[PDB]
Every structure is written in structure tokens, then in C-alpha cells.
């Protein structure tokens, strides 16, 4: 889930 939430998309 770092893909989704380690940056703001």
C-alpha cells in the first residue's frame, strides 16, 4: 500500500 499512499495521488 506504499504505492498508493507514500505520495498523494
Amino acid at each position, epitope marked *: 500500500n506504499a504505492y498508493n499512499m*507514500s*505520495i498523494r495521488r
Partner: antibody
């Protein structure tokens, strides 16, 4: 399974340009932005920008807008950082990252000669 | 742009004790009920390693000795207990607004 393999260290002359690479394996780069970071021991970590390899769209931090050019090639699964008009303050370790910003390359050292 | 200020700049901690590192953002890094603050660990010669994302999520592969708290402008990384291998420099990073920015780092030593 995801590996970001960065190119070897470079000694560069003032005024020149250099192009660094970030070869990704275990991940299709069309699937996410690639980010570039700069690190100096005194000034610390800075985000240069990100590129979307699927469409070539780029976003830079203002301080890197006339220094860095990010490109990418999905076919070779490689991203590039070109640094222009090199000066002493460009000597640094440069990192690429993806999967949000979870996975990082090992860094490429750029040294600038006198 | 968002400025991140870490506290302390360095600390020495006894093996087995708790440690906290603080990161304060000059403006909020919240959006839609989430807080876009990451924590990284770096050892010399190595790339930064992601510990915590979106303030409180533990990254896969990272021991549960590490945890994150906070929202808005005020964040903390907690290490419980500290172990020998934790000697490193720790950075916060916000990814809520462009350009992303990093704190100045906190160097942890084990005494």
C-alpha cells in the same frame, strides 16, 4: 523483486553536461512515476521532480527547472536524468525512486573537478 | 513550499530504551483525511530506506519496533526498543504538495 540499478559514478567538468540512468527490473515503469532526488552532506535531500513514463509528462521543483531534464523509455524500462551547465553545487549523490517513493536506486555519485 | 524541521538534530540513546524523533511542517500536509508524511532511515553509503508512510503505516519488511504518529503539522517517529542496528540518520519527507520536501535529518547513535 523490484530493482532500480543506477549508472556508475561520474567525474564531470564545470560547464559540461552529464546524463545519469536508472534501469528498472521487476516492474513496468509505465506503471508509476519515477522520482529523482539529490543529496549533499550539508544541504541534505532535495526532490528534483517526477516523470510519468507512460506519457512523458514531467513536473520539476522550481530550483531544478533550468538544471535537470528527466526522460524515460518504457521499452528499455530506463529513466534518465540529464544535468546541464555543471557547477560545484551540482556535486552530489543522485537517486531514482518509484512505487510511490518506496523503492530507491543505489545512488550515482557526481563529482565536479576544478 | 513546505519546510520540515526535525528535533533533535542528533541523539545518543541507551540500548533497549525508547526514542522519539519529531518532524514539524510549516503548513499542513493533510488531504482528504490522510497525512502525507514519510519516514526514512539511511546508513552511510546506502540509499534511504522507507520505514513509515502516510504518517502511521509500517512499510513491509520493517520491524514493528518502528511506529509513526501525528497529523496536520506535527509528526513523530518512535523506536521501541532501540537496537544496535538502529544507528543511522532518520529523515521525514512530505509528499502532499509539490515540490516534495525533506527534513534536515536526525542522527541516532547507540551509547
Amino acid at each position: 523483486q523490484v530493482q532500480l540499478q543506477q549508472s556508475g559514478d561520474e567525474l564531470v567538468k564545470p560547464g559540461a553536461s552529464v546524463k545519469l540512468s536508472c534501469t528498472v527490473s521487476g516492474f513496468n515503469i509505465k506503471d508509476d512515476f519515477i522520482h529523482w532526488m539529490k543529496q549533499r552532506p550539508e544541504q541534505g535531500l532535495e526532490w528534483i521532480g517526477r516523470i510519468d513514463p507512460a506519457n512523458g509528462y514531467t513536473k520539476y521543483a522550481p530550483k531544478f527547472q533550468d538544471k535537470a531534464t528527466m526522460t524515460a523509455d518504457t521499452s528499455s524500462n530506463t529513466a534518465y536524468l540529464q544535468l546541464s551547465s555543471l557547477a560545484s553545487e551540482d556535486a552530489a549523490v543522485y537517486y531514482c525512486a518509484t512505487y510511490g517513493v518506496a523503492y530507491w536506486g543505489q545512488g550515482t555519485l557526481v563529482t565536479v573537478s576544478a | 513550499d513546505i519546510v520540515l524541521t526535525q528535533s533533535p538534530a542528533s541523539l545518543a540513546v541507551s540500548l533497549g530504551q525508547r526514542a522519539t524523533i519529531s518532524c514539524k511542517a510549516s503548513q499542513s500536509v493533510d488531504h482528504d483525511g490522510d497525512s502525507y508524511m514519510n519516514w526514512f532511515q539511511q546508513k552511510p553509503g546506502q540509499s534511504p530506506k522507507l520505514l513509515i508512510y502516510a504518517a502511521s503505516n509500517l512499510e513491509s519488511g520493517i520491524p514493528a519496533r518502528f511506529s509513526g504518529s501525528g497529523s496536520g503539522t506535527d509528526f513523530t517517529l518512535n523506536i521501541h526498543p532501540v537496537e544496535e542496528e538502529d544507528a543511522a540518520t532518520y529523515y521525514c519527507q512530505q509528499t502532499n504538495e509539490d515540490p516534495y520536501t525533506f527534513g534536515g535529518g536526525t542522527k541516532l547513535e547507540i551509547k
